[PDB]
Design a protein around this ligand. Structure first.
Ligand SMILES: Nc1ncnc2c1ncn2[C@@H]1O[C@H](COP(=O)(O)OP(=O)(O)NP(=O)(O)O)[C@@H](O)[C@H]1O
Ligand SMILES: [Mg+2]
Ligand SMILES: [Zn+2]
Ligand SMILES: [Zn+2]
Lengths: 250, 102, 628, 54
DNA sequence: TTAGAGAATTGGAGAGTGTGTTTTTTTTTTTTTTT
DNA sequence: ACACACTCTCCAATTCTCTAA
């Protein structure tokens, strides 16, 4: 079964990356800034791309921006698929990270959203939407490796399982793929073939000047990944953007 | 570029020192001596060490004593409202653990 | 004839409840309620004939809002719903649902029948909810019994604390691991109805579907802790508390120290012995499931307020009406009235913010009725606290580490008045806490694991007796009061009240107090003309919200002159600011937008009168008792 | 409109005075939904038959 | 064209087996001995 | 010993196929 909205969003975001076609800061000449940003990334072997929400707002009567805003968690994989093709088209040197080289895990980033919420304004109706938040940092965790994609091999026979997907808990295969063996136990995680990510936990509390009458400040836990770990510092004031999520009792 | 131009323009002035002293804590009437002291603390001295490895302190500590209604807390309020790295604490409502580390 | 729908275990038919409530909703008019009320004479024939709920529904449509209040007495006024009133109390879960689906259908019917421009899809998308209230007599928290389970209840109390918002699941989302088919499933009775096999025809496989947490749908839940009011506690015992569960609209409504009345179903549930197994305990947990919360305008109100403000005797009228049964003490009453109004709050782009609040100290002889006055202020103010000197610690008065932070008296009292009695009994250690809160109206904290600053826009009203416990005329006034100068400098008004013997005074006082015992429950009151407490509260509240006086140049000249007069001779710089603040409070009380010469002169006069300055020896600082 | 644990209980009486029980708040008002929800609880489905390869 | 006799495939009833469980601060109110 | 999770096994319900009236 296939989601048509995802494919149409994918190949519309593709066209935005191709031909946003803003004119120069000094002259009436088309500049194509996002293609230039891809070239810049190629020059410096970067892994993240920044997009302006105002540029997306004016595109195609705003429907694309609405779909990205209200259903970010559904559409984020399709946005990744859309960007991969464009980088292949104009800068295939960026697709890889001598023996063979694994693929680059690109990160899309957004800024200049219309409004900033307080920690006190987080409510369950907004789960999975795109938001921006501000507060004072009070604690930070050390950087830890998070398992992103896994690969296992069987003890009772020479067989391998690859690209197993994790979500919130450490997860392992359901069968031995070789039908000559039935053992489900004694898997081991191949640290060379599997892939990890950088992960950091930080904790924030409300701005003192914003607290309402007779009340006290609430707090929140925030997750940082990739090239943004250790950017935050205790006692500083920061502004964040991302999506709010819900975490189980593992 | 415009920031550099503005900074150069005020750097060139003959009367810069007096204007700087006069611009600390605008709401407080008089007490130019304390304002001058606050400016010099904010700028600070030069940190250094000797061949022996001993360090020489490069910064300035200040204390203000006064009888009531002398507006002495306004200086602390201005400093904590202005200086990029600063914290305000009350001697009654704080602990040694909360002051250093816990 | 046909199958029927029946509330389980009742033989009540849903058709009758639906039709009766529809008829009530589309034909009730306010005049019927006045028939149940004491007189037909009250009726305004023009207004009271109107279809009240149709008017409300039109407003809901055009204001874009989703909830309808309903006081249950109207169900008794209309003849067709006299029995529905009882059925509501006995079967709330079913009856309330019936009412909801009635209101939504009526809203649709209005736009399609009156053929209006509004989007039908928009109205179909929304949820509409009734919120019944004023159901009957309130019930004591300890007197709820196991025969009240699942019936509607009404409670009064005070709010202790609220937990943060909890996400509550409402719809589950499944996805097939092999073929990527998806299904949305409805949650009822807390159990997820997971499919046995993947429902796509060609992928009919077992264990094939799986849950996706962050594509589910959730709703807000919160728990509020309500405490028993002292009016109901048994003799020689301490108050109890009960927990309220609240959802969606009402979630963040209420703060610590609030005083409320609620309405909700009284529920009970089992609890498990361990998290591994289905074993339940024999005792059941109990709680309340609220559907409405209430705190304990018209052109006629504005007309009354403007007309009262035009009276010549207004200042004396308001002052003698805050505490009607207390004899004389007019200057004390006046100062307290100006504390109630307050100054104006000011904030600059730079140079800070300046307090509008007034601090008052009452000091003098025993039996002078100081503490009796504190009772009136504590009950008049919308928010506030009463406490005693030996009852208070430094932590309890401000804030408490518990890792979480918790509120004390001055924080609960924010925006209100904090009454402190036996102020002379608390230690110098505890009193030193008040310096920062009175000067700045903020509380700074720096302890293990917590460092922050909190707001405290709190007015202090204090009561004390002098050193030696009776005022000694052989010592100067500052030595009789005996507070240290850094703390005595922070009060806007300081009053001396003295137990001076005089036959003229004593006969009047004796006649006043003995007159209260001529009746069982007295109707007698000290004066012919006083305002009711409700209307007086309305006046003060409106004047606080709408009026914001400014300094006139004339007022500036008089303030400078007056300060130099008190100064040249001790008056500190705070005497100037407190004069400004008192003059502003006086201006609000007349509903003026400007401070004038008259207001400045009243502020000066009241300061001179409070500390008996005219009777003070200007050089020795002693008071001539003969001049009092 | 209201949450998943608020729900009351419904009874439906047939001809010949026999009664059934269903839960949830929408069943109180919508008989079509109640009738459909009633049959949906029942466990069995008949198992089924199935052309091309190579 | 119906139907009835024989063979093959599948479901789940239900019987069986193994398993897990009890159980150094830091902050704040109060009493007591010590200078 | 008392609820649970998981495995094993047998038996009959079911549909498919062939034959003759
Ligand atoms: N002017 C008055 N009007 C009304 N009651 C009065 C007056 N003067 C004294 N009383 C009565 O005398 C008693 C005063 O008690 P109280 O309010 O505690 O006075 P106080 O100033 O707080 N004295 P103390 O607590 O000893 O410092 C109460 O019963 C009052 O009703
Ligand atoms: Mg008293
Ligand atoms: Zn194997
Ligand atoms: Zn499937």
């Amino acid at each position: 079964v296939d989601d048509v909205t995802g494919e149409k969003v994918r190949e519309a975001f593709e066209q935005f990356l191709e031909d946003f076609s803003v004119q120069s800061t000094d002259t009436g000449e088309v500049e194509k800034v996002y293609r230039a940003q891809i070239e810049f990334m190629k020059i410096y072997d970067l892994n993240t791309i920044y997009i302006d929400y105002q540029h997306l707002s004016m595109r195609e009567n705003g429907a694309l921006a609405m779909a990205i805003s209200e259903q970010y968690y559904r559409f984020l994989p399709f946005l990744q698929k859309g960007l991969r093709r464009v980088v292949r088209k104009y800068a295939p040197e960026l697709l890889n990270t001598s023996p063979e080289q694994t693929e680059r895990v690109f990160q899309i980033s957004f800024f200049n959203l219309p409004t900033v919420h307080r920690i006190r304004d987080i409510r369950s109706e907004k789960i999975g939407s795109l938001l921006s938040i501000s507060g004072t940092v009070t604690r930070t965790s050390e950087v830890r490796p998070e398992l992103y994609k896994a690969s296992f091999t069987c003890d009772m026979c020479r067989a391998i399982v690859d690209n197993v997907e994790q979500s919130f808990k450490y997860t392992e295969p359901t069968f031995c793929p070789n039908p000559s063996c039935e053992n489900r136990a004694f898997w081991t995680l191949n640290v060379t073939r599997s892939r990890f990510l950088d992960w950091q936990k930080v904790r924030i509390q409300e701005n003192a000047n914003e607290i309402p009458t007779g009340s006290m400040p609430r707090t929140l836990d925030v997750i940082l990944r990739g090239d943004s770990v250790e950017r935050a510092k205790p006692g500083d004031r920061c502004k964040f953007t991302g999506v709010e999520i819900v975490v189980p009792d593992v | 570029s415009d920031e550099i131009n503005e900074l150069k323009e005020m750097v060139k002035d003959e009367h810069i020192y007096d204007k700087l002293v006069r611009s600390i804590a605008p709401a407080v009437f008089g007490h130019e001596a304390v304002k001058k002291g606050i400016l010099l603390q904010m700028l600070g001295g030069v940190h250094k060490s000797t061949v022996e490895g001993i360090k020489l302190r490069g910064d300035i500590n200040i204390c203000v004593v006064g009888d009531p209604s002398t507006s002495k807390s306004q200086f602390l309020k201005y400093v904590v409202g202005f200086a990029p790295r600063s914290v305000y604490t009350s001697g009654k409502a704080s602990s040694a653990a909360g002051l250093t580390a816990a | 004839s046909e199958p029927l729908r029946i509330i389980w275990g009742t033989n009540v038919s849903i058709q009758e409840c639906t039709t009766n409530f529809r008829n009530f909703l589309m034909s009730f008019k306010y005049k019927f309620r006045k028939i149940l009320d004491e007189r037909e004479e009250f009726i305004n024939n023009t207004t009271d004939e109107e279809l009240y709920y149709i008017k409300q529904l039109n407003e809901m449509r055009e204001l874009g809002t989703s909830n309808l209040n309903l006081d249950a007495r109207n169900l008794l006024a209309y003849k067709q719903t006299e029995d529905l009133y009882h059925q509501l109390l006995n079967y709330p879960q079913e009856v309330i649902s019936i009412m909801d689906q009635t209101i939504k259908d009526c809203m649709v019917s209005l736009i399609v029948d009156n053929n209006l421009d509004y989007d039908l899809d928009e109205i179909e998308t929304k949820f509409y909810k009734v919120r019944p209230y004023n159901v009957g007599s309130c019930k004591g928290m300890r007197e709820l019994n196991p025969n009240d389970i699942d019936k509607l209840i009404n409670l009064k109390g005070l709010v202790l604390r609220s937990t943060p918002v909890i996400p509550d699941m409402k719809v589950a989302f499944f996805k097939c691991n092999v073929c990527d088919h998806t299904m949305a499933v409805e949650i009822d009775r807390g159990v997820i109805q997971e499919p046995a096999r993947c429902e796509r025809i060609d992928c009919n496989e077992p264990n094939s579907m799986s849950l996706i947490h962050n594509r589910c749908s959730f709703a807000d839940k919160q728990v509020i802790k309500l405490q028993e009011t002292p009016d109901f506690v048994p003799d020689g015992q301490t108050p109890h508390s009960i927990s309220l569960c609240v959802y969606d609209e009402l979630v963040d409504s209420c703060r610590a120290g609030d005083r409320i009345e609620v309405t909700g179903t009284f529920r009970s549930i089992p609890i498990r012995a361990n998290s591994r197994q289905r074993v339940l305990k024999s005792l059941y947990k109990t709680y309340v499931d609220v559907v409405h919360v209430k705190k304990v305008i018209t052109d006629q109100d504005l007309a009354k307020i403007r007309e009262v403000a035009a009276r010549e005797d207004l200042y004396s009228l308001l002052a003698r009406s805050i505490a009607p049964s207390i004899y004389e003490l007019e200057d004390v009453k006046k100062g307290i009235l100006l504390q109630l109004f307050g100054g104006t709050n000011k904030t600059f782009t730079k140079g800070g913010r300046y307090r509008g609040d007034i601090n008052i100290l009452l000091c003098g002889d025993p039996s002078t009725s100081k503490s009796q006055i504190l009772q009136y202020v504590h009950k008049i103010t919308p928010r506030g606290v009463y406490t005693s000197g030996k009852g208070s610690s430094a932590v309890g008065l401000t804030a408490y580490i518990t890792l979480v932070l918790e509120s004390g008296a001055l924080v609960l009292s924010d925006g209100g008045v904090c009454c402190i009695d036996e102020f002379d009994k608390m230690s110098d250690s505890t009193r030193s806490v008040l310096h920062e809160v009175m000067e700045q109206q903020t509380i700074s904290i720096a302890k293990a694991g917590i460092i922050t600053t909190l707001n405290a826009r709190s007015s202090i009203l204090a009561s004390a007796n002098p050193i030696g416990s009776r005022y000694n005329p052989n010592l100067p006034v500052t030595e009789n009061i005996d507070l240290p100068p850094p703390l005595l400098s922070r009060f806007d008004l300081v009053y001396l009240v003295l137990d001076k013997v005089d036959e003229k005074n004593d006969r009047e006082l004796a006649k006043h107090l003995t007159n209260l015992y001529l009746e069982d429950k007295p109707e007698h009151i000290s004066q012919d003309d006083v305002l009711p407490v409700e209307f007086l509260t309305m006046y003060i509240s409106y004047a606080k919200e709408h009026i914001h006086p400014i300094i006139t140049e004339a007022a500036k000249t008089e303030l400078v002159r007056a300060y130099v007069g008190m100064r040249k001779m001790t008056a500190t710089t705070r005497q100037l600011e407190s004069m400004i603040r008192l003059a502003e409070a006086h201006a609000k009380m007349k509903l003026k937008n400007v401070v004038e010469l008259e207001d400045v002169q009243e502020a000066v006069r009241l300061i001179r009168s409070a500390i008996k300055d005219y009777a003070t020896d200007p050089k020795t600082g002693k008071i001539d008792m003969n001049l009092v | 409109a209201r949450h998943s644990r608020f729900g009351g209980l419904l009874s439906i009486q047939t001809p010949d005075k026999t009664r059934l029980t269903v839960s949830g708040s929408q069943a109180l008002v919508d008989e079509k939904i109640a009738l459909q929800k009633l049959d949906d609880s029942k466990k069995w489905n008949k198992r089924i038959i199935k052309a091309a390869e190579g």
